[PDB]
Structures are given as C-alpha cells and as structure tokens.
Nucleic acid binder design. Sequence first.
DNA 1: AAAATAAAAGGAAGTG
DNA 2: TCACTTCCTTTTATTT
Length: 91
Amino acid sequence: KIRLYQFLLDLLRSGDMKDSIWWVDKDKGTFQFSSKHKEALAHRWGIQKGNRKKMTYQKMARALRNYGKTGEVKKVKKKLTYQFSGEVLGR
DNA sequence: AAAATAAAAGGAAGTG
DNA sequence: TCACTTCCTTTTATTT
C-alpha cells in the first residue's frame, strides 16, 4: 500500500492540489499547506486509505510527527511547513 | 494588552 | 511489528 509521504510527494510533483500544497524550495525539499484549503487534502488521503472516519489535518499531521524518528519527513519551524529527506527525493 | 483562533506537540490505545 | 489512526490533552504560535 501507499505511505503518506509518497502521497504528498506525488501531489507536489503532480500539481494536483496546487491550491492546498505547493513546493517552498523544490531543491531543498520543503513544502507547505494552505491554511484555508488543507482540510480538503486531508479528506482525500483518508479516502484513499479507507479509514473508519473521515480524515482531518489534525490527524494527518499527527501521522507526520511520527516520521520525525525514522527521518523521512522532519517538521520545519514555520507555519504548516515540512521537509522531505534527501533519501525520499534523490541524492 | 489582551483575546480568540490556529498551530504544534505528544502519550496512549485502537486498527488491519 | 508496521503504518498509521483515533482520541485526548497540553503547550506554543499566530491572527484577530
């Protein structure tokens, strides 16, 4: 099955939800969410997983802080900002 | 100088 | 044991 960061990385390289998520530094691997239109992206992710309840950002973001330990995606000290690890993008 | 509102944080139990 | 998911609470940041 699909992991969350791959669902995000795909949208970014897709332009699928440019309104809800966009690159901040495609180089450095930084991305950001829209404060207004983020809940719509969270809803889709939950829909692609088949969860028992509809997905919110608060819960999706919870799954993001777990990546902190494994290294895939680290939080950035800026509103609604995260960063992919080099291993996820390339070299 | 406060509120109000949103973001971040993280323990713990639940789910296939 | 993954990979989140759900819930709850508290702290921190921003915006109003």
